[PDB]
Structure formats: C-alpha cells, structure tokens
Amino acid sequence: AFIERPEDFLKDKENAIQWEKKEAERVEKNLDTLEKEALELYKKDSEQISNYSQTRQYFYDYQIESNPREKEYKNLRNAISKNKIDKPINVYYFESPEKFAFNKEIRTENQNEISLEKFNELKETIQDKLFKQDGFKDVSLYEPGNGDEKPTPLLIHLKLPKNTGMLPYINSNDVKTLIEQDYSIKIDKIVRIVIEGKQYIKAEASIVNSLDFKDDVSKGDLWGKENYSDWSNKLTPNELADVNDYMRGGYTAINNYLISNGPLNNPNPELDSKVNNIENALKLTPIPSNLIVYRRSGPQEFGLTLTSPEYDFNKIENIDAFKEKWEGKVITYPNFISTSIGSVNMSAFAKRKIILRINIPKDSPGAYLSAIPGYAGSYEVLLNHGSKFKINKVDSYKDGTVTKLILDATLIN
Amino acid sequence: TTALVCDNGSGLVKAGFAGDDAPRAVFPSIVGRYVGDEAQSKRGILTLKYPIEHGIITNWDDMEKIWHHTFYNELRVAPEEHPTLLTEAPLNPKANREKMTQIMFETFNVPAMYVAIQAVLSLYASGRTTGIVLDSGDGVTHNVPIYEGYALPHAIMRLDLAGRDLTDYLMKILTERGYSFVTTAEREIVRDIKEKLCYVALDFENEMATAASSSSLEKSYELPDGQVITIGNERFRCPETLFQPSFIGMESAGIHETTYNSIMKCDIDIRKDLYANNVMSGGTTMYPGIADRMQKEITALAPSTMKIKIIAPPERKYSVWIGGSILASLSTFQQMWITKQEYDEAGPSIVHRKC
Ligand SMILES: NC(=O)c1ccc[n+]([C@@H]2O[C@H](COP(=O)([O-])OP(=O)(O)OC[C@H]3O[C@@H](n4cnc5c(N)ncnc54)[C@H](O)[C@@H]3O)[C@@H](O)[C@H]2O)c1
Ligand SMILES: Nc1ncnc2c1ncn2[C@@H]1O[C@H](COP(=O)(O)OP(=O)(O)OP(=O)(O)O)[C@@H](O)[C@H]1O
Ligand SMILES: C/C1=C/C(=O)O[C@@H]2C[C@@H](CC[C@H](C)/C=C/C=C\CC1)O[C@@](O)([C@@H]1CSC(=O)N1)C2
Numbered sequence: 023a024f025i026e027r028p029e030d031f032l033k034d035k036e037n038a039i040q041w042e043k044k045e046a047e048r049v050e051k052n053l054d055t056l057e058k059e060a061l062e063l064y065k066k067d068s069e070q071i072s073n074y075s076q077t078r079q080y081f082y083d084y085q086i087e088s089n090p091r092e093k094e095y096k097n098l099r100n101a102i103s104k105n106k107i108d109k110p111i112n113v114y115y116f117e118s119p120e121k122f123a124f125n126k127e128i129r130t131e132n133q134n135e136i137s138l139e140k141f142n143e144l145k146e147t148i149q150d151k152l153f154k155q156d157g158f159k160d161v162s163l164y165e166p167g168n169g170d171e172k173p174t175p176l177l178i179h180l181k182l183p184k185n186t187g188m189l190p191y192i193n194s195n196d197v198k199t200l201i202e203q204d205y206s207i208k209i210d211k212i213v214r215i216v217i218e219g220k221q222y223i224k225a226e227a228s229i230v231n232s233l234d235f236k237d238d239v240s241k242g243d244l245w246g247k248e249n250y251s252d253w254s255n256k257l258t259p260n261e262l263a264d265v266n267d268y269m270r271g272g273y274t275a276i277n278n279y280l281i282s283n284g285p286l287n288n289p290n291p292e293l294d295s296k297v298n299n300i301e302n303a304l305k306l307t308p309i310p311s312n313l314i315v316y317r318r319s320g321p322q323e324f325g326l327t328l329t330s331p332e333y334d335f336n337k338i339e340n341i342d343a344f345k346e347k348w349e350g351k352v353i354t355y356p357n358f359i360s361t362s363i364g365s366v367n368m369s370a371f372a373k374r375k376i377i378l379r380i381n382i383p384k385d386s387p388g389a390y391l392s393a394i395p396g397y398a399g400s401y402e403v404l405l406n407h408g409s410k411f412k413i414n415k416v417d418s419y420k421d422g423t424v425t426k427l428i429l430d431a432t433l434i435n
Numbered sequence: 436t437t438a439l440v441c442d443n444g445s446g447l448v449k450a451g452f453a454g455d456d457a458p459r460a461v462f463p464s465i466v467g468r469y470v471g472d473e474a475q476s477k478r479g480i481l482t483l484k485y486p487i488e489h490g491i492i493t494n495w496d497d498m499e500k501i502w503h504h505t506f507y508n509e510l511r512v513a514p515e516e517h518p519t520l521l522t523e524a525p526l527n528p529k530a531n532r533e534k535m536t537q538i539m540f541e542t543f544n545v546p547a548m549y550v551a552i553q554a555v556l557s558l559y560a561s562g563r564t565t566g567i568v569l570d571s572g573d574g575v576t577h578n579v580p581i582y583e584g585y586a587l588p589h590a591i592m593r594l595d596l597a598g599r600d601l602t603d604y605l606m607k608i609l610t611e612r613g614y615s616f617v618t619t620a621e622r623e624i625v626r627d628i629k630e631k632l633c634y635v636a637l638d639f640e641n642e643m644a645t646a647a648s649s650s651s652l653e654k655s656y657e658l659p660d661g662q663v664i665t666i667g668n669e670r671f672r673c674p675e676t677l678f679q680p681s682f683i684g685m686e687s688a689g690i691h692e693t694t695y696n697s698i699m700k701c702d703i704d705i706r707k708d709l710y711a712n713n714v715m716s717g718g719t720t721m722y723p724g725i726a727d728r729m730q731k732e733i734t735a736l737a738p739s740t741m742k743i744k745i746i747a748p749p750e751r752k753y754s755v756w757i758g759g760s761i762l763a764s765l766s767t768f769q770q771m772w773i774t775k776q777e778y779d780e781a782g783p784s785i786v787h788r789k790c
C-alpha cells in the first residue's frame with residue numbers, strides 16, 4: 023500500500039479492508055458513549071433504523087419531536103457527519119432497480135445474462151435524471167468480487183466528494199462503512215460487467231448537493247430571510263402590489279386565468295400585467311443555491327378527486343397505476359405554484375396524499391415569499407408560472423393507516 | 436365619552452357601546468357595487484360584496500364604507516366623539532392593523548382607538564386569561580391558545596372552513612335530496628334552516644344508520660311561500676363537515692384535530708390548562724351537540740388521564756363583542772388607548788407598541 027490512500031480502492035479488497043479497519047480504530051477515539059451506543063443499536067436494528075431515517079421528516083413537527091426514535095437518528099447522524107473525508111472516495115453498493123424507477127427485474131437471479139433489451143430500457147429509464155437519496159446506508163470501499171455477497175443485478179459505483187461524512191466501524195468479523203445519504207444521484211453511465219459468472223449492471227454515479235431543510239423549518243426560514251430581505255425592498259411598487267394581491271388570495275383568479283388559457287382566448291390586460299409583474303418579481307433574486315422544496319398536492323393536479331377509487335394508495339394496484347401514468351413523465355403547471363422549504367405535515371393539508379419533492383437548480387426563478395412580513399408561516403417559495411417538472415421516482419410511506427406518495431421531481435426550466 | 440366596540444366579521448358586524456351587555460347593531464358585512472341590508476335592497480344594477488374574507492380585510496375602500504355605515508347609520512354617533520375599539524383576526528398582518536389605525540385617525544378622525552384580538556376578547560368574556568379558544572364564524576375558524584392573557588402565535592391554527600361553507604354544503608345535499616336550493620336568496624333560506632335545525636352527532640356513523648332506518652330524525656321547515664319541506668340526515672351531515680372537511684372536498688385537519696395540534700404546539704407545562712379550558716365562540720359553534728362531540732374527539736386523541744373541559748356559553752355568538760365591551764370599560768385599559776396625539780407623534784406603527 024501507498025502512504026496515502028487512493029480515491030478508489032477498486033478491486034484491492036485486502037488494502038480497502040485494512041485501511042478501513044485502521045480508520046474504524048481511529049474514529050473510536052472521537053465517538054462519545056452515546057454515539058457508540060447509537061452504533062451498537064444500529065448493528066442490531068439497522069433496517070428499521072434506516073427506514074426511520076428515510077421518512078421521519080414528513081410528519082407533524084410535534085409528532086417528530088415526540089418520537090423516541092429521534093434520539094438514535096440524531097446521535098448516529100452526529101457520529102457520521104463528524105468524520106469527514108478530506109478528499110474524494112468512491113464506494114460500492116447494490117440497489118434494487120426499483121430504487122431508480124425501473125420497476126421490473128433486470129434479470130432474474132437464476133439467469134446469468136442481461137438482454138440488450140433490458141439494458142437499453144434501464145438506460146432510457148435512468149438517463150438525464152437526478153435521484154434523491156435519504157437515510158442511513160452501508161457501503162463498501164471495494165468492488166464486490168468472487169465470493170462476495172451480491173443481492174441484486176445493479177451495482178452502484180458512487181463518487182463521494184471531499185467533506186462527506188463516513189463512519190468506519192466493525193461489526194463482529196466485518197469492517198463496514200456507514201453514510202447518511204443527503205444528496206441526489208446522477209447516473210453518468212451504465213455498463214454491463216461480469217462477476218463470478220453473472221452479468222451485472224454497473225452504474226457510474228456522482229452526487230449533486232442541494233439545500234434540504236426537511237423538518238428544520240427554522241434553519242430554512244433563517245436561510246430564506248437571509249437571502250430575500252432586500253428582495254422584499256427592491257421590488258417596484260407595482261410588483262410589490264401585485265405580489266401582495268397574489269398572496270392575499272388573488273392567486274385563485276390569476277392562476278385560473280392562466281390555467282384556462284385566458285391570455286389567449288379571453289385576454290385581460292389587467293391580469294396579464296399582474297402575471298408579468300409577479301414573474302419579474304421572481305426573476306429579481308433567483309434561487310441562490312440548489313434547493314429542495316416540498317408541496318402537498320391536491321389530487322386534482324394528478325387528475326383525481328377525493329372520491330376517485332384510484333386515490334386509494336393503500337391498494338398497491340393504485341400505486342402501480344399512478345407510477346405507470348406519472349413516473350418518468352414531465353408535468354407542467356400553467357399557474358404559479360406554491361412550495362415550502364419544509365417537509366413537515368400541517369393542519370391545512372394534513373390529509374393530502376401526494377407530496378412533490380422538487381429539486382430547484384441554483385438561479386431558477388423563484389422567491390422566498392415568507393421574507394415579506396404578514397404571512398411567513400408557510401415558509402413559502404413561489405415558483406414561476408409555466409414551470410415544468412420531471413418526475414424521477416415515486417415512493418410511498420405510511421402516515422398512520424394512510425399510504426401517501428412522495429414524488430421525487432426536478433424543475434427543468 | 437362612551438367608547439364604541441366594533442367587532443368586524445367576515446359575515447356580520449357587531450357594534451355597540453362599551454358597558455352594554457350586547458351589541459346595539461348587528462348587520463351584514465357587505466357592500467353593493469350601499470352597505471348592509473341597503474346593499475341588497477337595490478342589488479340589481481349592483482352585486483353584494485364581502486370586504487372581509489376569512490377574517491381579514493381585503494378591500495379598504497369597501498371597509499371604510501362599512502365603518503361609515505357603522506358610525507352614522509347603525510350607531511348614530513360621530514366618530515370624532517368616541518374612542519373606538521376594533522377587533523381583528525388572530526395573525527392579522529401587521530400592515531393591516533397599521534392600515535386600520537391610519538383609516539380610524541386620518542379618515543374618521545377618532546379621538547382614540549385600539550385593536551384587540553377576537554379570540555382573546557372571547558376568552559375574557561368568560562372571565563378567563565388562560566385557555567384555548569375555538570372561534571368559528573361565517574368565514575374562518577381558529578384555534579387560539581392563550582396563556583395569562585397572551586395569545587401564542589406559533590400555536591395558532593386557522594381553517595378556511597366556517598358557516599358559509601356549511602350553508603353552501605347544506606344547499607347541495609338538500610338539492611340532492613330532491614329540493615332545489617341554488618340562488619343567493621335561497622342561500623339565505625338555507626342558512627336559516629342550518630341555524631334552526633342542524634346539530635352535531637355524537638357518533639356520526641351510528642347517526643347515519645339510525646336515520647337510514649327511521650323517520651325519527653326528520654324535521655320540517657316552512658319556506659317563505661308556505662311550501663313545507665323535510666330535512667333528515669342533512670341536519671347532522673352539514674356540521675359534520677367541521678370534523679370531516681373531506682365532505683366539502685377539503686383535505687385539512689378537522690376542528691378536533693386542529694385543537695389537538697394547537698395544544699401540542701404549546702409548552703408541555705401549560706397543555707393541561709388548555710385541555711381544562713377549551714372555550715368556544717362564534718356563530719358556527721352554536722350547534723347543539725358540538726361540545727359533547729369535541730369532548731369525545733379530544734378524549735380519543737389525548738392521554739387517557741387527561742381532564743378535558745369544553746366551555747360553550749349560551750352567549751358565545753357575541754362573546755368577542757362582550758369581551759370588547761368589558762375590556763374597553765376597564766379602569767386599567769384606559770392607559771392602553773392609542774390617542775390621536777400619539778398617532779400624530781408616532782406613525783400607524785404605534786399599533787404594534789400598544790396593540
Ligand atoms: N400545498 C402546499 O404544499 C403549500 C406550500 C406552501 C404554501 N402553501 C399556501 O397554501 C395556499 C395555496 O394552497 P394550494 O397550493 O394547496 O392551492 P392551489 O391554488 O395550488 O390549489 C387549489 C386547487 O387547484 C388544484 N390545482 C392547482 N394547480 C393545478 C393544475 N395546474 N391543474 C389542476 N389542478 C390544479 C389543487 O390540486 C387544488 O385542488 C397559499 O396560501 C400558499 O401560500 C401551500
Ligand atoms: N344558531 C346557529 N347555528 C349554526 N350556525 C349559526 C347560528 N347562528 C349563527 N350561525 C352562523 O355563524 C355565522 C355568523 O357568526 P359570526 O358573526 O361569529 O361570524 P363572523 O364574525 O361574521 O365571521 P368570521 O368570524 O368567520 O370572520 C354565520 O355563518 C351564521 O349562519
Ligand atoms: C340573519 C342573517 C345572518 C347572517 O349571518 O348573514 C351573514 C351576512 C349575509 C349577507 C347576505 C344577505 C344580504 C344577508 C342579509 C341580512 C342579514 C344577515 C342574515 O351573508 C351570510 O348570510 C352568508 C351567506 S349564507 C351564509 O351562511 N353566510 C352571512
């Protein structure tokens with residue numbers, strides 16, 4: 023081995039393991055008793071602890087706060103985020119293709135080959151998409167090889183940048199590596215390889231970071247006020263007037279005008295002027311960082327109503343039908359559209375079942391409206407009329423007895 | 436010399452004199468484009484318009500007309516001669532209360548005024564400074580937790596679901612029964628049916644079985660032209676909407692759940708006091724059976740050892756106004772009035788320092 027580790031151990035399993043063993047031993051010196059306790063519990067209950075780490079943020083603020091699982095989540099997350107790599111490292115792990123919205127088998131486990139057919143279907147499915155990742159995950163510093171465990175046909179080869187938190191540790195005979203996913207994945211390239219007599223897809227993947235405040239709405243509100251206080255004071259009197267009219271409930275008229283294509287077949291100069299001013303307000307201080315926002319959608323956005331049989335997502339067939347209709351598709355909103363920096367459920371939309379989780383590229387049109395005094399309880403980011411979103415992936419989760427959907431989407435204009 | 440109390444709502448203005456036990460005037464919060472029952476006496480060349488929407492003033496020109504009508508036509512006083520207490524919704528924007536203050540001093544030239552939070556006044560009407568208020572009117576409903584006289588803004592819940600939505604829902608389900616209630620005048624009729632015949636069922640699914648199985652729950656109502664109609668399960672399906680907003684297509688928490696959410700947003704140390712002092716005010720809390728039903732729903736959500744009390748006085752339709760009448764007439768309140776002189780010295784933003 024060299025004195026300095028490589029960015030990628032590749033197939034050098036023996037050095038990867040030894041290095042990470044020394045690393046586990048060094049990090050033991052920086053974990054307090056509670057963090058060590060958190061790790062032990064994770065070793066014993068990893069699946070449920072990871073599961074909690076993926077969907078904890080979607081409940082009421084007070085439900086999150088009083089869940090005793092928060093202690094484990096917080097203490098383990100702190101153990102990880104502390105131990106930051108000082109240059110990039112590549113990691114390896116197997117995923118279900120379903121995770122990247124390929125809802126069928128690439129090949130069965132008893133087959134050894136992957137058809138060009140499947141290969142091309144997978145490529146078209148995972149091309150040109152940013153897939154959101156959450157929660158705790160065990161990864162390998164070396165590529166799985168002959169006699170390694172390989173649960174699926176999809177191997178992810180992920181590059182992680184400098185300052186990524188990684189927790190090297192030992193679980194009985196094995197040296198492991200824990201991360202908490204907090205980014206989106208781009209699959210730059212897929213290739214078919216062979217390991218121990220079977221074909222696997224290897225995905226060359228990298229990450230895109232975004233600000234995601236999740237349930238930390240105070241941190242998100244500080245960020246918003248930080249960045250949009252003078253936007254609040256830089257609007258023309260016309261723009262401020264029209265924004266406040268919009269926010270005060272003028273939105274319903276303005277947005278229905280837009281959705282009905284009023285500008286074409288029923289023009290109205292008064293409304294057109296307001297639409298223009300609001301748009302110009304949203305271009306005044308473009309979204310200053312990649313940002314995740316959340317919207318609790320009415321079913322009508324997805325062609326459903328409250329009493330639509332297909333809105334019963336407690337039945338898996340209805341989830342499948344939703345995915346077949348929407349997953350991988352791009353949708354457009356002729357209206358201006360409200361989102362929040364927070365993921366928490368709220369009284370006003372406590373029962374809405376469809377959550378949009380949207381990646382907003384830096385410099386997109388948009389504004390943290392809640393930087394205007396009067397109604398900041400929304401933690402609102404208003405997006406521009408005519409926005410287009412690519413739906414990357416549909417997940418589901420339980421909110422009590424009710425199955426709800428999370429739509430991993432990206433703003434593409 | 437005598438202070439005025441003007442409780443401005445989405446549907447009705449309640450106005451009168453501090454020290455009286457009831458408002459002298461209650462009239463509709465509408466303008467014609469004329470105010471109140473004048474705005475509909477000639478609603479031909481004109482249309483009825485509601486300046487206060489979901490508890491918030493949205494049109495200042497129209498609101499000036501409402502206040503004009505209040506002083507000169509309803510109370511027959513000069514604004515220049517009376518300190519005037521106005522009420523506002525919880526979480527009323529700060530620019531709204533500044534604009535209310537500006538209009539009072541610069542348009543009406545009042546000698547003094549004050550703006551009080553409606554829910555705080557209704558709590559005070561029952562002699563309390565600590566409790567959680569369910570205030571439900573024509574346009575909006577709030578849960579407002581209050582501790583030692585201070586509303587707790589981070590724990591306030593607002594639902595845009597109230598009496599007018601219940602009226603409109605009743606029109607629809609009566610129409611599905613075989614009647615036809617659709618026009619603006621028919622909407623007034625159905626509001627009347629709602630106010631006289633509706634109630635909240637203690638057990639809703641049970642109540643729906645009963646009604647399906649008997650005429651035991653049916654009631655009759657005589658229309659203005661003498662046609663007598665029947666109303667059955669609509670009596671309780673109508674206000675059931677408050678607990679189940681999906682009845683009108685809304686995916687919000689119902690009023691029991693917003694009450695619980697509000698309490699859960701408060702400091703743990705004060706939650707027992709809130710549970711023990713759930714107070715109801717406003718016209719849409721007048722349904723027989725609503726207190727019992729809330730008791731049952733909150734009992735299901737809260738810890739089994741929790742002592743829950745719902746307070747629903749017979750006067751609660753006017754308890755915001757009554758609270759204002761008591762407040763404005765207190766010795767220790769007199770120092771709190773914003774005088775015209777204070778307005779001249781300090782801007783409209785004087786409201787924030789004094790309230
Ligand atoms: N929903 C959220 O997650 C969210 C986030 C932040 C703030 N808000 C606040 O709540 C209020 C806005 O509520 P909202 O966003 O639920 O109402 P909205 O105006 O977006 O939706 C009104 C109704 O129209 C439907 N709709 C909207 N766009 C549509 C389209 N293009 N095609 C078909 N149907 C469409 C919705 O499903 C809903 O039934 C505002 O005060 C806003 O500040 C909401
Ligand atoms: N006995 C009753 N039963 C049911 N509803 C009633 C009764 N009396 C009045 N209401 C309803 O209460 C509403 C009026 O009450 P209130 O004056 O408290 O509201 P507001 O102050 O005008 O509106 P808001 O408080 O929402 O701004 C109307 O919808 C009316 O139909
Ligand atoms: C006795 C009464 C009570 C009342 O609350 O009226 C208020 C005010 C009213 C204005 C429209 C017409 C002019 C009313 C005129 C006169 C007096 C008030 C009527 O619009 C409501 O009716 C709406 C419509 S239906 C409903 O649920 N709210 C609420």
Ligand SMILES: [Ca+2]
Binds near residue numbers: 443445717755
């Ligand atoms: Ca009121």
